[PDB]
């Protein structure tokens, strides 16, 4: 539950965003101007929040805006991530100036969240006017799923989304569900907006086999690079410039819902292409037969993708989860946050799963099976 996103609350987020900008302006960080660039994103977020306030110019319009379900969640998430960025700089101390530290890695995670949130707020409020109830999901079969389970909702909790998705496309485990949350919930707010659903369904289309497409194209494919920048894609492929057909594919933080395939040409140049509103695996199979996409990340083995026209280990899901912000969520259910600590092993989970486990005569801790000497309520942050 969130409080009303009134003018006073919207302004509190501006002051927090301002603090983050000054922290990130420190030249000891040697911050790359490559996307997501927090120094462009936060002022652009402020300008969009002003554009929204200029459209709702009277007290009655402001009251309607303050009680908008999506707007309340958005302002609360914006406040939370800004406070989190301030805390990261405080606790990080000198580790913020170490490009390879976990504190800096967390800053990249926040920068990506702020980037995704800006694209989301511009899609839901184009020109500062709410259009969430009129948001058009690109894929019709995916739009019918959203309309069936969520009606005209602009945003739904992750918990409800995952349960309803499972009715159509089965999710085989807690780790898979955790990996799926980090892929769809781009803003890391424990909700799925109709815009995040549109991005995910555009990337892993067709809808009919979306989870097989996601598992084969992203979780386990050696060519998949997530939001690795164009410069890093070219520098990664530079090592294989003597192997024509070496290719990698990435997501674009400035072009959400689109893929960018970098590859080595016959003359050793590294070129890129953005496939149309077509399935990524189709472009990859087309490119394989034509001779452009043969070696995913220079690897001589190109996985056979032709099965998607008509398995993943727990370890594979665990590795995939590292780039995300899912540490705060119970690993057993992947729907409730961790709120309880076992003693003396220290394993964390939600109370509901611990109760289910104790009521099943499960011996000791569900993770390690050491005797549960006691429990303690806790609050976990994704960066612990
Ligand atoms: C810049 C880029 C990168 C860097 N090296 N590489 C190979 C990729 N990057 C870096 C981070 C970092 F942890 F902050 F460092 C985090 C992500 C990242 C953050 C959240 C979700 C994801 C997605 C994801 N993709 N694979 C796993 N996840 C979990 C791609 C989404 C649709 C889910 C990636 C990322 O993209
Ligand atoms: Na989200
Ligand atoms: Zn749980
Ligand atoms: Zn344990």
Is position 13 annotated in a ligand binding site?
Answer: no
CB-based contact 362:309 (threshold 8 Å): no
CB neighbour class for 345 (10 Å; exposed up to 12, middle 13-18, buried from 19): middle
Residue 320 and residue 219: Cα distance in Å, rounded? 6
Q: Which two tokens stand for residue 101?
A: 């530290």
Angle at which helices 69-92 and 102-124 pack, to 10 degrees? Answer: 160
CB-based contact 28:93 (threshold 8 Å): no
CB neighbour class for 166 (10 Å; exposed up to 12, middle 13-18, buried from 19): middle
C-alpha dihedral over 250, 252, 253, 256, to 10 degrees? -120
Q: Which two tokens stand for residue 280?
A: 């990524």
**160 to 75, 157, 312: CA distances (angstroms):** 21, 6, 24
**Architecture of domain 327-384 in this structure:** 2-Layer Sandwich (3.30)
Residue 225 and residue 144: Cα distance in Å, rounded? 30
Q: Which two tokens stand for residue 117?
A: 């949130």
Q: Which residue has the tokens 């709120």?
A: 339
Cβ neighbours of 85 (radius 10 Å): 25
Q: Which two tokens stand for residue 3?
A: 């409080």
CATH of domain 230-302: 3.30.505.10
Q: Where are the chain's structural domains?
A: 7-131, 135-217, 230-302, 327-384
CB-based contact 161:153 (threshold 8 Å): no
Query: Kindly report the CA angle at 111 between 184 and 106, in degrees rounded to 5?
Result: 90
Residue 91 and residue 89: Cα distance in Å, rounded? 6
Q: In what order do the strands lie in the sheet containing 259-264?
A: 270-273, 259-264, 246-251, 295-296
Residue whose CA lies nearest to ligand 1 atom number 4: 228
Is position 191 annotated in a ligand binding site?
Answer: yes
**Of 187, 226, 262, 296, best ligand 1 pocket probe by most atoms within 8 Å of the beta carbon:** 226
Query: Among 208, 228, 229, 226, which residue's Cα sits nearest to residue 217?
Result: 226
Residue 204 and residue 353: Cα distance in Å, rounded? 31
CATH number for 135-217: choose from 2.60.120.10, 1.10.238.10, 3.40.50.261, 3.40.720.10. 1.10.238.10
Residue 229 and residue 13: Cα distance in Å, rounded? 28
Atom of ligand 1 nearest to the CA of 219: 26
CB-based contact 191:156 (threshold 8 Å): yes
Is position 104 annotated in a ligand binding site?
Answer: no
Cβ neighbours of 173 (radius 10 Å): 13
CB-based contact 280:203 (threshold 8 Å): yes
**Architecture of domain 7-131 in this structure:** Up-down Bundle (1.20)
Phi then psi for residue 239, to 5 deg, are -60, -25
Q: Which residue has the tokens 């991530």?
A: 81
The number of the ligand nearest the C-alpha atom of 217 reads 1
Query: Among 241, 229, 301, 239, which residue's Cα sits nearest to residue 268?
Result: 241
Residue 33 and residue 37: Cα distance in Å, rounded? 6
Residue 12 and residue 374: Cα distance in Å, rounded? 41
Residue whose CA lies nearest to ligand 1 atom number 13: 323
HEC profile of the chain: CCCCCCHHHHHHHHHHHHHHHHHHCCHHHCCCCCCCCHHHHHHHHHHHHHHHHHHCCCHHHHHHHHCCHHHHHHHHHHHHHHHHHHHHHHHHHHHHHCCCCHHHHHHHHHHHHHHHHHHHHHHHCHHHCCCHHHCCCCCHHHHHHHHHHHCCCCEEEHHHHHHHHHCCCCCCCHHHHHHHHHHHCCCCCCEEEHHHHHHHHHHCCCHHHHHHHHHHHHHCCCCECCCCCHHHHHHHHHCCCCCCCEEEEEECCCCCCCEEEEEECCCCCEEEECCCCCCHHHHHHHHHHHCCCCEECCCCCCCCCHHHHCCCCHHHHHHHHCCCCCCCECCCCCCCECCEEEECCCCEECHHHHHHHHHCCCCCCCCCCCCCCEEEECCCCCCC
CB-based contact 96:29 (threshold 8 Å): yes
Q: Which residue has the tokens 């494919």?
A: 221
Q: Which two tokens stand for residue 341?
A: 């600590």
CB-based contact 227:112 (threshold 8 Å): yes
Angle at which helices 158-166 and 140-150 pack, to 10 degrees? Answer: 120
Q: Which residues are registered as beta bridge partners of 375?
A: 342
Q: Is 32 in the pocket of ligand 1 (CB under 6 A)?
A: no
**376 to 147, 185, 194, 337, 349: CA distances (angstroms):** 41, 29, 37, 15, 11
CB-based contact 340:356 (threshold 8 Å): no
Is position 213 annotated in a ligand binding site?
Answer: no
CA 356 vs. chain centroid, Å, equals: 29
Tell me which method was used to determine the 3D structure.
X-ray
Query: Kindly report the CA angle at 309 between 257 and 185, in degrees rounded to 5?
Result: 30
- Taking the centre of ligand 4 as the mean of its atom positions, its distance from the CA of residue 374, in whole angstroms, is 11
Phi then psi for residue 273, to 5 deg, are -150, 145
Q: Integer distance in angstroms from the first to the last C-alpha of the chain?
A: 24
CB-based contact 220:266 (threshold 8 Å): no
**4 to 11, 17, 63, 280: CA distances (angstroms):** 13, 19, 9, 41
Q: Which residues are registered as beta bridge partners of 48?
A: none
**28 to 41, 98, 186, 194, 231: CA distances (angstroms):** 20, 9, 29, 39, 22
C-alpha Rg value of the chain to the nearest Å: 22
Q: Which two tokens stand for residue 184?
A: 């769809």
């Amino acid at each position: 539950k969130q409080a009303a996103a009134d003018r006073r609350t919207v302004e509190k987020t501006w002051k927090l965003m301002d603090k983050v900008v000054r922290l990130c302006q420190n030249p000891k960080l040697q911050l790359k101007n490559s996307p997501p660039y927090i120094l462009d994103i936060l002022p652009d977020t402020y300008q969009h929040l002003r554009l929204i306030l200029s459209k709702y110019d009277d007290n009655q319009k402001l009251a309607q805006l303050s009680e908008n379900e999506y707007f309340k969640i958005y302002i609360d998430s914006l406040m939370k991530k800004s406070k989190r960025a301030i805390r990261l700089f405080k606790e990080g101390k000198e580790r913020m100036y170490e490009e390879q530290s976990q504190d800096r890695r967390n800053l990249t995670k926040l920068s990506l969240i702020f980037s995704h949130m800006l694209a989301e707020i511009k899609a839901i409020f184009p020109n500062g006017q709410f259009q969430g109830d009129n948001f058009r999901i690109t894929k019709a079969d995916a739009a019918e799923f959203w309309r069936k389970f969520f009606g005209d909702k602009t945003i739904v909790p992750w918990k409800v989304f995952r349960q309803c998705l499972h009715e159509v496309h089965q999710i085989s485990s807690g780790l898979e569900a955790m990996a799926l949350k980090s892929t769809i919930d781009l803003t890391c707010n424990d909700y799925i907006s109709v815009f995040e659903f549109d991005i995910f369904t555009r990337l892993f289309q067709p809808w009919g086999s979306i989870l097989r497409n996601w598992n084969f194209l992203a979780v386990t494919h050696p060519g998949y690079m997530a939001f690795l920048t164009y410069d890093e894609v070219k520098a990664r492929l530079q090592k294989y410039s003597t192997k024509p057909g070496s290719y990698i594919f990435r997501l674009s933080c400035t072009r959400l819902g689109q893929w960018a395939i970098g590859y080595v040409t016959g003359d050793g140049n590294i070129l890129q292409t953005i496939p149309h509103n077509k399935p990524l695996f189709q472009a990859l199979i087309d490119g394989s037969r034509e001779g452009f996409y043969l070696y995913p990340d220079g690897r001589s083995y190109n996985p056979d993708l032709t099965g998607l026209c008509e398995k993943v280990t727990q370890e594979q899901y665990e590795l995939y989860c590292e780039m995300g912000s899912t540490f705060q969520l119970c690993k057993i259910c992947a729907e409730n946050d961790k709120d309880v600590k076992i003693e003396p092993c220290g394993h964390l989970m939600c109370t509901s799963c611990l109760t289910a486990w104790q009521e099943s005569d499960g011996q000791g801790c569900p993770f390690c099976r050491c005797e549960i000497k006691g429990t303690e309520p806790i609050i976990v942050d994704p960066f612990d």
